[PDB]
């Protein structure tokens, strides 16, 4: 009796939850495009020590020479 005789206007006997009952791609047939089985370390060893050098790494839309192709120095 927290407030039974005290206050007769407070809720009880209420099942306000509203229940229910327990009642519970890879079309590779085509020949469209391949994939590669990821192995980050394999590709890491693939691109292992490419000493690419960026001498004059310029790719602007400048017009003053013949052509521009950076990422060119090697070992």
């Amino acid at each position: 009796d927290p407030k039974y005789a005290d206050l007769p206007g407070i809720a009880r006997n209420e099942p306000d939850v509203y229940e229910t009952s327990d009642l519970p791609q890879e079309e590779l047939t085509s020949t469209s495009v391949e994939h590669i089985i990821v192995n980050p370390n394999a590709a890491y060893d693939k691109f292992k020590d490419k000493r690419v050098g960026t001498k004059g790494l310029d790719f602007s839309d400048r017009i003053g020479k013949t052509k521009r192709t950076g990422y060119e120095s090697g070992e």
């Binding site: 691109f47 490419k50 690419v52 790719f59 052509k67 521009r68 192709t69 950076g70 990422y71 060119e72 120095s73 090697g74």
Partner: protein, 182 residues
């Protein structure tokens, strides 16, 4: 001493090569000189641009070509040197300059200054012990075995007819027109 020379057959466009006493010129290809017609950024390619050899056929639609041996006469000395350096590659030669002599071909009626500069290259930059260059008609004589006769040869842009009896020259008798297949 033992230094087998290398028979190197030049030509208008094509060059052939193989050691002495062989039967087939071990390496043959033309004056194709290429370098990438495009721009690469992403890693995976090769670097240097002087990519001439089987890679050129492998990468035809990628590089720009040129032929500096105009009518059998060298223009881009530097590039010809590079070509010859490519010839000097291991899988291409494995030998050194001083290690072996070389035989070469002379297309007649050309300025000898070409030969001058080239001789300076092969005997100063490279240091070949001896290098002889000669008339291509003599080559045909040995192939035929005969010594009398005329021989008109034609590469890709030069034609020359050589009338020589018994291997004995008649320089005035020789004639030519330098234009062919190109």
């Amino acid at each position: 001493i033992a230094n087998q020379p290398v028979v190197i057959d030049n030509g208008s466009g094509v060059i052939k090569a193989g050691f002495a006493g062989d039967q087939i010129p071990k390496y043959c290809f033309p004056n194709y000189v290429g370098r990438p017609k495009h721009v690469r950024v992403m890693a995976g390619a090769l670097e240097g641009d002087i990519f001439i050899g089987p890679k050129a056929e492998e990468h035809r639609g990628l590089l720009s070509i040129r032929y500096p041996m105009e009518h059998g006469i060298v223009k881009d000395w530097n590039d010809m040197e590079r070509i010859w350096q490519y010839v000097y590659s291991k899988d291409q030669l494995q030998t050194f300059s001083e290690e072996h002599p070389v035989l070469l071909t002379e297309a007649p009626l050309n300025p000898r200054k070409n030969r001058e500069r080239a001789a300076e290259v092969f005997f100063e930059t490279f240091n070949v012990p001896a290098l002889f260059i000669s008339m291509q008609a003599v080559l045909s004589l040995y192939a035929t075995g005969r010594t009398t006769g005329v021989v008109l040869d034609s590469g890709d842009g030069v034609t020359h007819a050589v009338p020589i009896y018994e291997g004995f020259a008649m320089p005035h008798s020789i004639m030519r027109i330098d234009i062919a297949g190109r």
